[PDB]
Amino acid sequence: EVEGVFVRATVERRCRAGFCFDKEGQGFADGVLSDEQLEALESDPLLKVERCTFSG
Amino acid sequence: EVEGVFVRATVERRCRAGFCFDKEGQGFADGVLSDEQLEALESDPLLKVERCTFSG
Amino acid sequence: EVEGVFVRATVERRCRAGFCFDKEGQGFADGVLSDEQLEALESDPLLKVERCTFSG
Amino acid sequence: MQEMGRAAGAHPDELVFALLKAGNANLCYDGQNFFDTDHPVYPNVDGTGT
Amino acid sequence: AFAPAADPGAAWYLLDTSRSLKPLIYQERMKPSFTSMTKEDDEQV
């Protein structure tokens, strides 16, 4: 099981091309790959964040 | 009337077809009918709740 | 810029056609115009408030 | 004994300097060599040596 | 018409004056309060 999910329509910093804008991607508290890119992508939320059990 | 919907921002337990998912915001708080099943319906308001009457 | 939006997917009180509703997230905090009507439109965030400036 | 003491005092010098000489051979916390051109420290990959 | 800048320092007014409104304060959430840490996963902001 993976612990870590953000499902409150919450905002996170995801960078597409030359800018970082609101979007929900990985949104997990565990990492095995893309750690250096995840840091920029996984900036903790701006707004209310609540976690669930995807169990994927 | 519906004294409380107990829906906004919260998701409760909904046991259907043998799998108890969490969605559809079926929260309620009254003694009208299916009072015993009210425990099962409200068995997992995992997320923060925010009541708002529908005046039903 | 925009001082604040206070949307959280909820307006304070958007009253039209003689009926007062709660939706469309039209919360502002500024004295640009319609401050007297801004008191009526605002001043009732029933649900939580999330401020995310649009930098408009 | 004075020679022994002087050598012991000088030991950190050669220790550190040999370590630095082994900069390319050895590595850093990040894992790659202490002096490489492809340090994956941050998404904007940079090279601390050419 | 990068952009440098030449500034004097003899006059007791210096360019780009700062206003320290309040001294730095470290706020915390050790108190038994807040939602994003109780309702939502612990955050101990």
Side-chain angles (χ1 to χ4, degrees), chain D residues 26-44:
Chain D
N26 299 17
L27 54 83
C28 73
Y29 55 92
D30 285 324
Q32 73 294 10
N33 294 335
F34 180 54
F35 268 91
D36 213 348
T37 186
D38 295 327
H39 296 261
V41 192
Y42 300 108
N44 51 358

Side-chain angles (χ1 to χ4, degrees), chain A:
Chain A
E1 63 280 17
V2 65
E3 57 186 355
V5 175
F6 313 140
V7 289
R8 291 297 88 192
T10 305
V11 173
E12 270 96 343
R13 314 271 91 81
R14 307 312 183 116
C15 318
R16 176 250 195 289
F19 70 95
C20 305
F21 181 75
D22 310 338
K23 183 65 170 189
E24 52 191 359
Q26 183 84 26
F28 296 168
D30 196 349
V32 75
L33 189 145
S34 283
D35 199 57
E36 79 294 9
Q37 194 187 355
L38 273 170
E39 168 58 287
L41 293 167
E42 81 199 347
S43 185
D44 285 330
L46 190 48
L47 272 77
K48 281 197 176 66
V49 73
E50 293 176 350
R51 183 177 292 171
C52 78
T53 316
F54 279 161
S55 66

